[PDB]
């Protein structure tokens, strides 16, 4: 017909998906450091997914691991462990 | 990002029971709400205390 006609194909310019920071990584109830990275420093409240940026699956896993650690004695409940205050900040929160 | 409205409302073809029950349609209006509408109390208390003690 005509060589210049468009050819059916997937978008070659499609950008890779923004995999959540924890995607492809094993969340564990013993990694109290990583679990504390996703709680409020002052109230120990688990941050919502809008703050954490995590996918749904990883947010659910983080929440369950936090609960497991808190109830099994690996993590504090009412506050972030002080030793992990200076850990990298991955939550889009701003109190001050 | 805005919370997903997919499958939230009660509609035909939606197997799940409603997640949201908006008393008003979730359609943007063409207007925004009007801007909704005791100082010196410490100074008053200080002056009144000075009066009390003098």
């Amino acid at each position: 017909s005509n060589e210049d006609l468009p050819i059916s194909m997937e978008n070659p310019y499609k950008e890779p998906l923004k995999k959540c920071i924890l995607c492809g990584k094993h969340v564990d109830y013993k990694n109290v450091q990583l679990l504390s990275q996703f709680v409020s420093p002052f109230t120990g409240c688990i941050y919502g997914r809008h703050i954490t940026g995590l996918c749904g699956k990883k947010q659910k896993e983080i929440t369950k691991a936090i609960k497991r650690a808190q109830i099994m004695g690996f993590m504090p409940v009412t506050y972030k462990d002080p030793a992990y205050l200076k850990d990298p900040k991955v939550c889009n929160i701003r109190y001050r | 990002a805005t919370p997903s409205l997919r499958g939230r409302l009660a509609r035909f073809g939606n197997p799940r029971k409603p997640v949201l029950k908006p008393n008003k349609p979730l359609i943007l209006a063409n207007r925004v709400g009007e801007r909704r509408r005791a100082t010196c109390i410490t100074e008053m208390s200080v002056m009144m205390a000075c009066w009390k003690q003098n």
Partner: protein
């Protein structure tokens, strides 16, 4: 002996350019308000950019400038909208003059 419309579309510069995201284009200041330059860059819609605080006087009608395109047309669908609302203008970053 006539080039097909498909041929012209395939071999036109706008088609040559891939996604407009962050591409560099050469625009022309076709209309200026006090501090708002309306720059045409060959796309369907022009962009609007504030006159830079530096060398702002150097920008004038027909002054050829360099832009970094963020979107050929600024549009978006809104809660309840049946069709996308468009502001009928491209979103581009003004980098400076070109010589």
């Amino acid at each position: 002996n006539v080039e097909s419309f498909a041929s012209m579309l395939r071999h036109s510069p706008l088609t040559q350019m891939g996604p407009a995201k962050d591409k560099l284009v050469i625009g022309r200041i076709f209309h200026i308000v006090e501090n708002d330059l309306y720059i045409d860059f060959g796309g369907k819609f022009h962009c609007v950019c504030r006159r830079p605080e530096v060398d702002g006087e150097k920008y004038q009608k027909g002054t050829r400038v360099r832009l970094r395109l963020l979107d050929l047309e600024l549009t978006s669908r809104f809660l309840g909208a049946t069709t996308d609302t468009t502001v009928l203008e491209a979103n581009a970053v003004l980098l400076g003059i070109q010589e």
